[PDB]
Each structure stands twice: as structure tokens, then as C-alpha cells.
């Protein structure tokens, strides 16, 4: 999945569309069932098209910079800047990823704001927290989560961000994705 | 997937576990992008194990009837009865399904209550609305939704309930599931 610099992406022809998305996350000192460390909580959402993705959407560059556009397309009813920028990937779409660490209290505030948003029940069908832990059965939690259906680029963006923000070791991300994919294969083999 | 009567399920040995779940839904006169009829909204949720399911959980029959247990395990921070019962299926677990039509306003109230619940961010990671429409590309909406990962029995329960409550024609449910499964197959073929 080709990476491109923000400033080079901005020079692409008018035939290129730009999407901007935000990964909002918080340290989570919670312990599921009092024994499984949650470590972090990340917000994703169910989109109108039945896929999981990050808050955000397409930015009309006739009106807005990437950052000004981002803040207007989050749909969370709620100021991200270049300081929050992570990377851009070619998917004729360039997908721009931003990330911001909040307190867990602030992350909950976003969830509350979201349910009261104007976009709730239209383009956004509900927020979900990503489980980053893996249960003893080696599938419950993050591997199962990664076996859901994601909008183009979002799954790759999630895994990229977890790595580069030092939220999970690369080895554990590789394992979780392998477990997810094996699960999908086995499930499809039962059906076919 | 074997069906069993409620009263026969109640006679099963102590080696059988019982789960009770609720499908809360409302008529939705909304039109996505002003052209796609939404028809109904149904609530599901992201569980702690990274799978989509209905609100509910295991009922300890040493303490509660199926109905008394159901109302205590919803996790929505909020009275379902035998009148709301739909069916029971053998999955060593019997999965009991209940359903209740609310106003859209009441359905939104449940979403608000849920984000403020004691279980939010523990066993429940967020509610989502099911998109029952299909976009012009024949995958956006319900087929994509059905391509997510579901906890045992939930996907079958959803499709069963949509049929028997006359919310979607059987032909359209069959089509949506076929589209979902073909999508999963094609996606897995790209990876392998
Ligand atoms: Cl576990
Ligand atoms: Cl469409």
C-alpha cells in the first residue's frame, strides 16, 4: 500500500479524491474480568455502508485544507492539526490518517457527543471501541475484531498507527492479523 | 440449526447453559442521501470478544427465569417478557431470542442509556445500528454488514427475526447473505 508525503499528495491532479480520518485513543488501565489488561481503547465506527472505519470522510479541497476539512467531516458532534498527522496512503483516492491521544474520560466524552450528533443514524451508525487484548483462546478480542469488515484502507491504517505510536509491538500485530485471517478462512470453509 | 420450544429447553440437564438476547428495533422513515429508504433500524453491539451480537448474555437459572435473567443481562443501563419471545436454538448452549419494536425515539433513548451504562467499555464496546438497505453497488449496507464477524447464533438469529417479524422478504434476506458470503470469499482470495 503506497505511502506518499502530505505535501506531495496535495499536488495531485483534480482527478484524485482526498479522505481524512482520525484515530482517537486513550490509555486504559482497566482489566477485563479483573485479569486481562486493556492497555488502550481506540474509537472506530460502523459506517452507513455496513463497514468499520475511522471517523472522518472525503474533504472537498475547493473549500478546505486537509486539516480544516478533517475537523468538519468527523461526524462526532464535537481541533486536529498537522501535529496529529501520521501518514497518507494511495488506496483514485489518497487516505490521510491523523491520531490524537485523549484521556479515557475525554474518549468517553466523545462517545457521548457522538450519540447526540447530527450524523448519528445517517452516515454513522455507532461507535465501537477496539479491543486490543487477546483472550486465552487466542482469538477473543483483537483477532476476532480484525476479522470484521473494514472500509478500504482502515484496517491497514489501524495496524500502521498501533505500530508507529508504539501502542503494540509489531510481532503482536502480525500475530493478531494472522489469527484473524486464519479464522476468516476456517469460517468460509464451513460455508463452502 | 436445531430449534427447540421454550418449555422443552427449560427441562434440559444442568449441563446446558442458557443465553438470552434481545433484538430491539424501530420503524425508520429516514432516507439515506435522501433516496434510500432505511425502513427499520435494529440494535446490535460490539462485544468484549470483538464480535457483533445482540444485547444480552448467559442467564444463571439457579437465580432467574429466562425472562427475569434476560432483563438483568442486557447491559443497556435501562421489561421484556414471554410476549416478546421469538424462538430458541441449540447452538452445549441454548440461545433464546426475544424482540421488541420501539419507536425510533425510544430506540435512540436506548443508545443514549447504553453509552452511560455500567457495562460500557467492559463487556460491551459500543452499539451499532444494522443497515437493512442495499446500495446500488449491491454490497453497500446490509450485505457488507453481514460480512462482519458475529458471535455464535447471532447472525442466524438476526436473519430469522427479520423474516418472522415480516421486516424483510425472505428472498431479500437470501440475496443479502449470498452477497455477503461472496464478498468474504473474494476478499480472502486476495489475501490467499
Ligand atoms: Cl480469557
Ligand atoms: Cl447508492
Swiss-Prot record, chains A, B:
Covalent cross-link Glycyl lysine isopeptide (Lys-Gly) (interchain with G-Cter in ubiquitin) as placed by the record, residue numbers: 2, 136
Record bears the keyword Ubl conjugation: yes
A single GO molecular function term of this UniProt record: snoRNA binding
Gene Ontology process terms (BP): negative regulation of double-strand break repair via nonhomologous end joining
Residues flagged as site, Required for interaction with TP53BP1: 2
Effect of residue 136 to E: Still able to interact with TP53BP1
Pfam families (alphabetical): Nudt16-like
Cellular component GO terms, alphabetical: nucleus
Subcellular location(s) of the protein: Nucleus
Domain of life: Eukaryota
Region (Interaction with PXN): 103-190
Membership in a protein family: Belongs to the Nudix hydrolase family. TIRR subfamily.
The protein's assembly and partners: Homodimer. Interacts with TP53BP1 (via the Tudor-like domain); interaction is abolished following DNA damage and TP53BP1 phosphorylation by ATM. Interacts (via the cytoplasmic part) with SDC4. Interacts with TGFB1I1 and PXN.
Name of the protein: Tudor-interacting repair regulator protein
Gene: NUDT16L1
Amino acid at each position: 500500500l503506497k505511502q506518499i508525503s502530505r505535501v506531495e499528495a496535495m499536488r495531485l491532479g483534480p482527478g484524485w479524491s482526498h479522505s481524512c480520518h482520525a484515530m482517537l485513543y486513550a490509555a486504559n488501565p482497566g482489566q477485563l474480568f479483573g485479569r486481562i489488561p486493556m492497555r488502550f481503547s481506540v474509537l472506530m465506527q460502523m459506517r452507513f455502508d455496513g463497514l468499520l472505519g475511522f471517523p472522518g470522510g472525503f474533504v472537498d479541497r475547493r473549500f478546505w485544507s486537509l486539516e480544516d476539512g478533517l475537523n468538519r467531516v468527523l461526524g462526532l458532534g464535537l481541533r486536529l492539526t498537522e501535529a496529529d498527522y501520521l501518514s497518507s496512503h494511495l488506496t483514485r483516492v489518497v487516505a490521510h490518517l491523523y491520531a490524537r491521544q485523549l484521556t479515557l474520560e475525554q474518549l468517553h466524552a466523545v462517545e457521548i457527543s457522538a450519540v447526540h450528533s447530527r450524523d448519528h443514524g445517517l452516515e454513522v451508525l455507532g461507535l465501537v471501541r477496539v479491543p486490543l487484548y487477546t483472550q486465552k483462546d487466542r482469538v477473543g478480542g483483537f483477532p476476532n475484531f480484525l476479522s470484521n469488515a473494514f472500509v478500504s484502507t482502515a484496517k491497514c491504517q489501524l495496524l500502521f498507527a498501533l505500530k508507529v505510536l508504539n501502542m503494540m509491538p509489531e510481532e503482536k500485530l502480525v500475530e493478531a492479523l494472522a489469527a484473524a485471517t486464519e479464522k476468516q478462512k476456517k469460517a468460509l470453509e464451513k460455508l463452502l
